[PDB]
Design a binder for this molecule. Sequence first.
Ligand SMILES: O=C(O)[C@@H](O)C(O)[C@H](O)C(=O)O
Ligand SMILES: O=C(O)[C@@H](O)C(O)[C@H](O)C(=O)O
Ligand SMILES: O=C(O)[C@@H](O)C(O)[C@H](O)C(=O)O
Ligand SMILES: O=C(O)[C@@H](O)C(O)[C@H](O)C(=O)O
Ligand SMILES: [Cl-]
Ligand code: NA
Ligand SMILES: [Zn+2]
Ligand SMILES: [Zn+2]
Ligand SMILES: [Zn+2]
Ligand SMILES: [Zn+2]
Lengths: 413, 413, 413, 413
Amino acid sequence: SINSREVLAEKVKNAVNNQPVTDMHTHLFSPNFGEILLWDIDELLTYHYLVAEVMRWTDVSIEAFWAMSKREQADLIWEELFIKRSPVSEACRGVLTCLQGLGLDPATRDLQVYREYFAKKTSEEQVDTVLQLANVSDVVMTNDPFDDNERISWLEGKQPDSRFHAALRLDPLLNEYEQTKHRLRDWGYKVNDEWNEGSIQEVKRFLTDWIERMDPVYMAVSLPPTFSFPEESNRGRIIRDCLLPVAEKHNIPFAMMIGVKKRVHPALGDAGDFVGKASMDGVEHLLREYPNNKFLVTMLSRENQHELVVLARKFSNLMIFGCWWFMNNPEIINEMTRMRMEMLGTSFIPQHSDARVLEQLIYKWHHSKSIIAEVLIDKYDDILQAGWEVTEEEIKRDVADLFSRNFWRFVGR
Amino acid sequence: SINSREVLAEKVKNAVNNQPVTDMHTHLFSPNFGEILLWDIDELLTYHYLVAEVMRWTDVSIEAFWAMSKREQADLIWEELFIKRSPVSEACRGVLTCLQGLGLDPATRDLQVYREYFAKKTSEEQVDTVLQLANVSDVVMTNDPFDDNERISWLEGKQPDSRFHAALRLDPLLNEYEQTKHRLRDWGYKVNDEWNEGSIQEVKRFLTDWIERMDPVYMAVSLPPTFSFPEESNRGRIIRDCLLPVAEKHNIPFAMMIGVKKRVHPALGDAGDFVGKASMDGVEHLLREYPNNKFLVTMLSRENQHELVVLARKFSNLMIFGCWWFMNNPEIINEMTRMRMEMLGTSFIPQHSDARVLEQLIYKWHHSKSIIAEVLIDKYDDILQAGWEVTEEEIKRDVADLFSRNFWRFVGR
Amino acid sequence: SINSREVLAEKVKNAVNNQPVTDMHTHLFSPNFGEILLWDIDELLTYHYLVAEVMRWTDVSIEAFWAMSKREQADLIWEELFIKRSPVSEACRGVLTCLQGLGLDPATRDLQVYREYFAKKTSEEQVDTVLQLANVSDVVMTNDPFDDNERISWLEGKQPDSRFHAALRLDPLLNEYEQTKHRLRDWGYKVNDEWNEGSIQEVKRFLTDWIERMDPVYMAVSLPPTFSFPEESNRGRIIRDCLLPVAEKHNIPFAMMIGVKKRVHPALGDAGDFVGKASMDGVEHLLREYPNNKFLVTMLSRENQHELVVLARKFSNLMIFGCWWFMNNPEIINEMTRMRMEMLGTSFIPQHSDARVLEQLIYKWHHSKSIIAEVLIDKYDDILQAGWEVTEEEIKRDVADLFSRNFWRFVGR
Amino acid sequence: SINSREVLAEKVKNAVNNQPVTDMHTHLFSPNFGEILLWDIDELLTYHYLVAEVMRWTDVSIEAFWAMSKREQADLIWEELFIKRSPVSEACRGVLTCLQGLGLDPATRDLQVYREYFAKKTSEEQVDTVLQLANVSDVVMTNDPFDDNERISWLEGKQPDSRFHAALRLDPLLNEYEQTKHRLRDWGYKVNDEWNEGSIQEVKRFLTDWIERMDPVYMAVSLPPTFSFPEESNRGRIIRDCLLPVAEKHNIPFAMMIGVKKRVHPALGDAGDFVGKASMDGVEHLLREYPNNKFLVTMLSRENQHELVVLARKFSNLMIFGCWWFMNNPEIINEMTRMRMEMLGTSFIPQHSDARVLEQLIYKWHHSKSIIAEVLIDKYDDILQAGWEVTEEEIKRDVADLFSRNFWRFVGR
Ligand SMILES: O=C(O)[C@@H](O)C(O)[C@H](O)C(=O)O
Ligand SMILES: O=C(O)[C@@H](O)C(O)[C@H](O)C(=O)O
Ligand SMILES: O=C(O)[C@@H](O)C(O)[C@H](O)C(=O)O
Ligand SMILES: O=C(O)[C@@H](O)C(O)[C@H](O)C(=O)O
Ligand SMILES: [Cl-]
Ligand code: NA
Ligand SMILES: [Zn+2]
Ligand SMILES: [Zn+2]
Ligand SMILES: [Zn+2]
Ligand SMILES: [Zn+2]
């Protein structure tokens, strides 16, 4: 038996640390796709999360910033966020966790020496190194066929190795149909200006074609805080008449990341998005009215978190996942994971990395695993006190479900 | 006087665990009322909180589940939530706490043996046992005159034990007046199709009649997130012209449990209710415009909790109570109780059990007391460090107010 | 070298304790303004925060309360909140902390003796004593030219000493222009009936004249949950045509304190204000459309805190500050500071005292600094463990930024 | 590098735990030697250290105790020292650590179940199991040619396996020559009544004969607190004319375990020995006057420990080792190890187990490694603080010296 919390803590920490992770949502790509897979210290430092932060300190105008080279940008952020002020924020701390994990020494602050480490490795080598360090066995990518560069790679035979899984990202189709319908036509999908049977079948064809070419684990889309459903709009009709039925047929879950308010600050680029609390009505309707469809949902507002958990108690076809973007900070990750486990036990997916830069897998999982471990230790200790006798194998089992099995079990694969 | 956190913690925990509890809201009934009072391990396992949870895991269809016998359902839940996955959720932990409390040993996981304990015992007995273990001196029931079985009971003179108190629940009357008014007719209450003096006075008779028959400590109603007041609706009118004036006459408080969205998932039965954030406008209005009325309030949305505390700072005729339903989880209980004590001192009612099954009193109060004691220890220790000295007597006094006195003083009994 | 959390806790606690504080928002006044500057134990006990709290207990009518003398009220509150029940609330705790900090001993509960301390001392002496004990180097006041007593003081030549700075509060002008315009004309400002060039120019003259006279660090206003911008109202036009242009010319930041619902309980006086969640739309617009203007923002609703931080991530012309009013409680201060640091690093102002009574400076900063120090320890420890070198000089630098430099840096002074 | 004490601690603990141990003094025997190798829970419970302790509580006479069967003695000790009083003593704590280490569960206190674990294993199997758990690579036995049983095993040609090493124990020869000389004669060693050339040569012959048969890593003897040298006694002459000369020729060190006063309480058997402070004169003389001889020393009196460390500072032919018997308690092990490291760096052997029962290897080493690890963390931290940069490889090296290499390097094998 586990006679003390101290022994329980060590055992839980070991289980969590040893458990290979399936990162069900990232912005990483199989290395064979080429330069689109971003990596190295300069990429880590230029992560848009750090761009927003540096802009709060530097005198360098945003225009000037974008005009600088990748190396110059990295130098500026290093100086502004690490040298001039202690790198205490979550994103800055993450850069340090990566460096340390790669065997580099943050104590020297020798940026040139860190760069040299990367300059002598191939992408294939760095992916092997990182996946081993972060103990990540499977990476789910975000594949947007509407992006010209991504589309051409797929059309020209590019396929990911077994460690990388595809996910059909449909933001342009679902949120900008008025513009996107023209491109569908240019690609041979005869969508009409009237939402008729022809338009429905062609949008379905598009989805089916890409499902066949990508073999996605799920279809996804990020939605605004004003998201509602049903709705007489292109989004409402495409979801209802095309997406859901196609998803039901192939038994592919629909991933909705709700709460992002796009481009409140255009100049910042990828760092210019904001957040807003959403109504749960649209989500509630979808789960109740489409019982044969699977939905993976993560929300951006802190104020949506608790009710999202309650909604998960209502419908089994709802699998909530991760602590997304602005929620991906220790204070939030902790409260979210606790409310989730208290109302759902182990029937959820606590985290994903959303890694845009390869090395981030190291800090994203290291930082989150330590928090999730502390939650588990409290929960296990609580039942041990109630007289329950939890075993190490059961612990390893629960941990496997949280970090990998629940996802694969849900996507039905 | 106490001059160390060590001794302080000793005395606080002692006062808290020794303090006789008055559960000012439950779904239990004096044992003389018969079977309506649920109890035993099978009832604990089939609590709807656990029904919602098992459905997220089990392959069994909700139809087949409802088709199963009580025993069969319990066995399914025990297997799905306790054996196949660690029973870490608050609801599952609660069952274990209950068993351990009764002397049973969760370490064995011998569901059969646990079952035998209850068999060889009677309702009258188990109530004495449970009330002894949970150290609860008074239990406030939820008495719905609109329920047939329950109604006939009060009609036949059935009086509840002196340790069980009555609460007049009016959900059907205030939320479904249109369908309810017809039943009011059948009971000699001549309500008119229109809201005239005739209808107003008959609704009052209905209320006054039951107040006499039940001698309730308060009248209660659960409301939706969209609750508004004033409001040109039956609820708005019935509350304004009947409930309020009557309540003020008998000097009886009005308990409003706001935030529940009923039947979002009909098939789940009692486990099918959801939650939503409410506007404080209505409660603000009621408290201000009706100073001679006493209001007991509790809300279901995590996002309503802080402003409710602030509202309690504004109006003394407002007494906030407990961490209701989806709020009844350690993470929320802790933050709620701390915000409350920081802005209200000891002028609020920290908790109620909402027990639907007798034994639940054990875990409900055990889990809550441990959290409440911790909060008290920190707050006492903070003033202790400022030089203030607290006596054990003052501690028992304070603990008395929180777990029993504030309620009786508020209702005026 | 700082090579452990233990050593770090020491250095951080020391740094925070020794860092002189610039309180960028208070209701204190330079001693040479006389009466208006409140102080002593009777004033502390009658802080409106404690009034609201006593009214939740004392059966003394609010009318009677206001009818009695300062000392009578102080005696009642002390009796009701310190003797009748342990003074565990934040506001009561504060009273005790101020006493101890002054040398008085709360263990004795000798109110009479505490009073003798203040009786034999001048105002000039008490400010010197308090500013020293609270380690506060600069105090920003709230100067409302619409208050007859304050306005006449400025008009007659009253100037604050080196330690007190002015802040031009404009609530009457922006939120009550209909009644206020009549007073502007009485003072020579020819604002017309319709919002035309003449009205715009005179309102500007009004602001400019007062900017010359007070030389304020910033212009301020408290706003309701329903605040919006742009908006066709006097507030919206005054801000758009008058406030912003003037603020930009003199490079004076605009301080918006959003979320207060005034007078939901008029009888309580200053203690009768409530809170409500606001939309971020207005703030988002102001920041994006007026890049040459600087904004200081703090919000009253707990539910606005997280999204306000994200907004700060989008705009560098936004500087968020403090845990205002109902947010100024440990539980909230803690969660707010951690969310801010995690997403903003050190680019924010964690706190302000909002002191109405001089002595409060002692407890406001002592209670807050302890929480902020603990947050810092956690954040520094996280990067230390990640391999980062943290020097005592860098800690002092960061601490100095948070408690003083960020403010002066933002205001351009 | 090692940036923090927390990381240093993890690395030191790991190095220490992972380092295979050479236990240079035990009372264990290679399994092929027979039943002389004691093992199992009953042997653990009847360890003489526990016999002395039980006699302080039990009403059972020492005579009756010796009359009981081994199983009965074990039952009594378990009841008296573990059940009737908490097993907080070091020797009792040790029994528990062994049980836990073997996978058994101390929480059940099921002595019968623990016994079942041992009945199904063979000596050779338990040796493999224990050496693995305790991470002991090499064991030094105590081989007494004067014990009939053991002597026969050697005369038969039995050899210990590669994991076990011999040490020629000479207590009978050196301390009881008058009686022992008669046995030397029966064995062919023609020693005379007078200490002449013949006696000296036969004694030497006896030593050489056994050194050739055992190939001991050292010759050893336990001495009384009155030990002196030079000395005109059989011990002084045998050491001067036989032991030392032989030891030099074979380059074999002489181990002296000084401070034991034998049989102060005869009836207690092996548990009847006491302790006394010794003069350092004889050891000082031996070290200085016999520079070509190597000496391994350990002393029993707490009051001899510091001066022994200082003596090691004077002579390189002196190797001090372990915390012997009455010194083998946490409080002493810690103060000893700290004085030794502070005055000798890593030039000493911190510990040996003195295990009489096989399983004790588990607790002796587990208990000592944790203390030693703590001392090392402190010392490394102090030099890290002085700017030194210790590497993980240097730590492993230092650890190997302390737990293994220093010994083998000193005995030149
Ligand atoms: O980096 C991010 O998290 C965002 O910029 C987006 O990639 C977001 O995660 C999304 O998937 O839409
Ligand atoms: O179990 C519960 O708490 C709910 O299902 C209801 O009983 C709720 O508490 C209510 O009283 O409306
Ligand atoms: O005491 C308070 O904080 C309030 O009553 C107001 O002074 C508020 O701080 C404001 O500045 O409007
Ligand atoms: O168990 C013991 O440590 C003693 O009884 C002796 O074995 C002593 O260690 C010795 O070697 O003489
Ligand atoms: Cl909200
Ligand atoms: Na919290
Ligand atoms: Zn993403
Ligand atoms: Zn209820
Ligand atoms: Zn203020
Ligand atoms: Zn020995």
